[PDB]
Ligand binder design. Sequence first.
Ligand SMILES: [K+]
Ligand SMILES: [K+]
Ligand SMILES: [K+]
Length: 41
Amino acid sequence: TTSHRPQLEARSGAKAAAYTPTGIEHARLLPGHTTLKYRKF
RNA sequence: GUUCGCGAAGUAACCCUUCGUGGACAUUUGGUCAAUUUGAAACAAUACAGAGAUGAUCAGCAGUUCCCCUGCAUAAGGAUGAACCGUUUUACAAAGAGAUUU
Ligand SMILES: [K+]
Ligand SMILES: [K+]
Ligand SMILES: [K+]
């Protein structure tokens, strides 16, 4: 059977760059650690 | 409509009452959209068949895809979700030999 295959190339992000996205709100993307820390001097 | 001012009629004259007249106040809603067949939802129903790696029965996890579905979801599930299984000819040259032709 040929359904079991090694990867010839990985799926590129350029394909998704052209897609029109949806407005789903992900739990991990909710506001958190909203302020950046900076070093002295 | 209200109110400020003016003409007038009524009244003995004011108040008050009416007809006329000027100014002030208040100033542009709503539709991406019409009410059954012809601008688009799907399941279901009838039939047949009964799931990959196998001699046999099965757990799977992935990858690739201009297939996605369920789910709050970057989780998980959907037959390992499904499809995958076919078709495949030239960067075409070098050395040499024996036959063909003037
Ligand atoms: K079966
Ligand atoms: K399985
Ligand atoms: K699965």
